Enzyme design. Structure first.
Site, PDB file in Angstrom:
ATOM      1  CB  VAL A  75      43.025   5.324  24.729  1.00  9.26           C
ATOM      2  CG1 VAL A  75      42.413   6.304  23.856  1.00  9.26           C
ATOM      3  CG2 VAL A  75      41.404   4.896  25.786  1.00  9.26           C
ATOM      4  N   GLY A  76      41.946   2.079  24.987  1.00 11.80           N
ATOM      5  CA  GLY A  76      41.335   1.001  25.696  1.00 11.80           C
ATOM      6  C   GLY A  76      40.273   0.427  24.938  1.00 11.80           C
ATOM      7  CB  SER A  93      36.760   0.218  20.666  1.00 14.65           C
ATOM      8  OG  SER A  93      36.476   0.490  19.364  1.00 14.65           O
ATOM      9  CB  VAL A  94      37.984   4.579  23.612  1.00  9.77           C
ATOM     10  CG1 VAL A  94      38.537   6.036  23.887  1.00  9.77           C
ATOM     11  CG2 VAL A  94      36.852   4.127  24.379  1.00  9.77           C
ATOM     12  CE  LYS A 108      31.230   3.387  24.575  1.00  5.21           C
ATOM     13  NZ  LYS A 108      30.124   3.406  25.608  1.00  5.21           N
ATOM     14  CG  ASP A 147      29.521   4.568  33.660  1.00  4.54           C
ATOM     15  OD1 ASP A 147      30.336   3.384  33.467  1.00  4.54           O
ATOM     16  OD2 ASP A 147      28.208   4.229  34.113  1.00  4.54           O
TER      17      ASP A 147
HETATM   18  C1  HYK Z   1      25.068   2.786  28.581  1.00  4.07           C
HETATM   19  C2  HYK Z   1      25.893   3.941  29.142  1.00  4.07           C
HETATM   20  C3  HYK Z   1      26.970   4.105  29.038  1.00  4.07           C
HETATM   21  C4  HYK Z   1      27.696   5.061  29.842  1.00  4.07           C
HETATM   22  C5  HYK Z   1      27.111   6.315  30.075  1.00  4.07           C
HETATM   23  N1  HYK Z   1      27.724   7.656  30.689  1.00  4.07           N
HETATM   24  N2  HYK Z   1      27.187   8.035  31.898  1.00  4.07           N
HETATM   25  C6  HYK Z   1      27.858   9.114  32.058  1.00  4.07           C
HETATM   26  C7  HYK Z   1      27.565   9.888  33.319  1.00  4.07           C
HETATM   27  C8  HYK Z   1      26.736   9.428  34.222  1.00  4.07           C
HETATM   28  C9  HYK Z   1      27.151  11.206  32.779  1.00  4.07           C
HETATM   29  C10 HYK Z   1      29.019  10.086  33.981  1.00  4.07           C
HETATM   30  C11 HYK Z   1      29.004   9.199  31.121  1.00  4.07           C
HETATM   31  C12 HYK Z   1      28.778   8.070  30.358  1.00  4.07           C
HETATM   32  N3  HYK Z   1      29.562   7.712  29.213  1.00  4.07           N
HETATM   33  C13 HYK Z   1      30.773   8.049  29.180  1.00  4.07           C
HETATM   34  O1  HYK Z   1      31.687   8.507  30.053  1.00  4.07           O
HETATM   35  N4  HYK Z   1      31.341   7.774  27.997  1.00  4.07           N
HETATM   36  C14 HYK Z   1      32.737   7.613  27.554  1.00  4.07           C
HETATM   37  C15 HYK Z   1      33.364   6.508  27.853  1.00  4.07           C
HETATM   38  C16 HYK Z   1      34.794   6.577  28.065  1.00  4.07           C
HETATM   39  C17 HYK Z   1      35.469   6.982  26.604  1.00  4.07           C
HETATM   40  O2  HYK Z   1      36.732   7.290  27.085  1.00  4.07           O
HETATM   41  C18 HYK Z   1      37.386   8.594  27.393  1.00  4.07           C
HETATM   42  C19 HYK Z   1      36.665   9.892  27.383  1.00  4.07           C
HETATM   43  C20 HYK Z   1      37.676  11.008  27.846  1.00  4.07           C
HETATM   44  C21 HYK Z   1      38.933  10.445  28.304  1.00  4.07           C
HETATM   45  N5  HYK Z   1      39.950  11.273  28.865  1.00  4.07           N
HETATM   46  N6  HYK Z   1      40.776  10.516  29.280  1.00  4.07           N
HETATM   47  C22 HYK Z   1      40.714   9.439  28.783  1.00  4.07           C
HETATM   48  C23 HYK Z   1      41.337   8.134  29.392  1.00  4.07           C
HETATM   49  C24 HYK Z   1      42.808   8.304  29.489  1.00  4.07           C
HETATM   50  C25 HYK Z   1      40.867   7.338  30.595  1.00  4.07           C
HETATM   51  N7  HYK Z   1      39.313   9.297  28.573  1.00  4.07           N
HETATM   52  C26 HYK Z   1      38.635   8.100  28.117  1.00  4.07           C
HETATM   53  C27 HYK Z   1      34.753   8.044  25.981  1.00  4.07           C
HETATM   54  C28 HYK Z   1      34.935   8.553  24.634  1.00  4.07           C
HETATM   55  C29 HYK Z   1      34.213   9.429  23.986  1.00  4.07           C
HETATM   56  C30 HYK Z   1      32.896   9.719  24.473  1.00  4.07           C
HETATM   57  C31 HYK Z   1      32.731   9.221  25.591  1.00  4.07           C
HETATM   58  C32 HYK Z   1      33.279   8.368  26.555  1.00  4.07           C
HETATM   59  C33 HYK Z   1      25.693   6.138  29.799  1.00  4.07           C
HETATM   60  C34 HYK Z   1      25.036   5.164  29.501  1.00  4.07           C
END
Ligand code: HYK
Ligand code: I46
Length: 327
Positions: free
Chosen positions: A26-27, A30-31, A46, A156
């Site tokens: 996706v991006g 890495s994801v 991720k 995030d």
């Molecule tokens: C050092 C650190 C970094 C991030 C954090 N954090 N803090 C928070 C909250 C404050 C609680 C908000 C959340 C996080 N970490 C976080 O969000 N992970 C995502 C990063 C995006 C990644 O991709 C995703 C996930 C779902 C999704 N649905 N659609 C699409 C794209 C088309 C935009 N996604 C793209 C991801 C894939 C797996 C699992 C997780 C993730 C905390 C500490």
């Protein structure tokens, strides 16, 4: 213990359980999008890059895993799974995180009703996060995941400055949760108008664009500013009054404009909270105080600890092992 399989997608190696099929980038860690054969859902996976490269990386690893295990709310990213191909602490060197795939962010994605629903969801998620004593600090369209049903989750990924609180551009150490309400204000503005509210080129340009709308500081706010250099700079600018928001955002639902004014107050101590914003008349069609839950207590005492890489790593390993998936 499941069976893992190995592949290379874009210079990056993925070793994931056979449960997870059709991996496609996706991006960018890495994801990947995958098919979760156990549930029939599409997921985002991720892979953390080099999670134990430094004390700071190792603590970031621990922090993201501890946070994602705690978040259980409809409008906040939650963990479906977490896994490592490692079979022992000793060989533990990779962490994968799994969540529900939404498929788009708010940049990708409006009537007044659509703005109501999207901002309601952001504030309902933020109520929850703020109730755990977490500040997000980087809310912006690219950290908001939206599915085809316009359901929204705060995440995030790790220009940011465009959505950033003026007190952060100024480098105030003691900023509070309402830095996130500022960001929501900047987002709602952009959804109503179709333009970036404050498209600053640098932290100085960003502050000047902000003070043009909300005015230079008044006396009550100036008294709270410790820094001589900060006051010297701000009070040396050409002094600017608060603009009439009814004029700036003319055409928008006047109830939307009234909420924008409560979010974008310059003094962070006077900004509306997330809980108060949910009760605002703009969200009458969505607001239900019985369906706006708060978080269980979140232990962040670890943030003040100074530990060895191997300690952050063993802590992270015990968190992977103790993970219990949601029903
Ligand atoms: C050092 C650190 C970094 C991030 C954090 N954090 N803090 C928070 C909250 C404050 C609680 C908000 C959340 C996080 N970490 C976080 O969000 N992970 C995502 C990063 C995006 C990644 O991709 C995703 C996930 C779902 C999704 N649905 N659609 C699409 C794209 C088309 C935009 N996604 C793209 C991801 C894939 C797996 C699992 C997780 C993730 C905390 C500490
Ligand atoms: F130009 C300005 C001046 C002050 C702010 C600001 C807004 N809310 N809180 C502050 C603040 C409080 C205490 N110390 C500070 F440094 C900043 C933002 C821009």
């Amino acid at each position: 213990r499941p069976t893992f399989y190995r592949q290379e997608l874009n210079k990056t190696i993925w070793e994931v359980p056979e449960r997870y099929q059709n991996l496609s980038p996706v991006g960018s860690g890495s994801v990947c999008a995958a098919f979760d054969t156990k549930t029939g859902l599409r997921v985002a996976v991720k892979k953390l890059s080099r999670p134990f490269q430094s004390i700071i990386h190792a603590k970031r690893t621990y922090r993201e895993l501890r946070l994602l295990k705690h978040m259980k709310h409809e409008n906040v990213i939650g963990l479906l799974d977490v896994f490592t191909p490692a079979r022992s602490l000793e060989e533990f060197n990779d962490v994968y995180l799994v969540t529900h795939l939404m498929g788009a962010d708010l940049n990708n994605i409006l009537t007044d009703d659509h703005v109501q629903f999207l901002i309601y969801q952001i504030l309902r998620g933020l109520k929850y996060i703020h109730s755990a004593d977490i500040i997000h600090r980087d809310l912006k369209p690219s950290n908001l995941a939206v599915n085809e049903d316009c359901e929204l989750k705060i995440l995030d990924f790790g220009a940011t400055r465009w959505y950033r609180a003026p007190e952060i551009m100024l480098n105030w150490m003691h900023y509070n949760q309402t830095v996130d309400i500022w960001s929501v204000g900047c987002i709602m503005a952009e959804l109503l108008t179709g333009r970036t509210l404050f498209p600053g080129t640098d932290h100085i340009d960003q502050l000047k664009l902000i003070l043009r709308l909300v005015g230079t500081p008044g006396a009550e706010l100036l008294k709270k500013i410790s820094s001589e250099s900060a006051r010297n700079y701000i009070q040396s600018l050409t002094q600017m009054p608060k603009m009439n928001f009814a004029n700036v955002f003319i055409g928008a639902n006047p109830l939307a404009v009234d909420l924008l004014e409560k979010m974008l107050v310059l003094d962070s101590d006077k900004r509306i909270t997330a809980a108060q914003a949910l009760a605002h008349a703009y969200f009458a069609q969505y607001h239900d105080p019985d369906d706006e839950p708060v978080a269980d207590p979140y232990d962040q005492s670890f943030e003040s600890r100074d530990l060895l890489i191997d300690e952050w790593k063993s802590l992270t390993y015990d968190e992977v092992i103790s993970f219990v998936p949601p029903p």
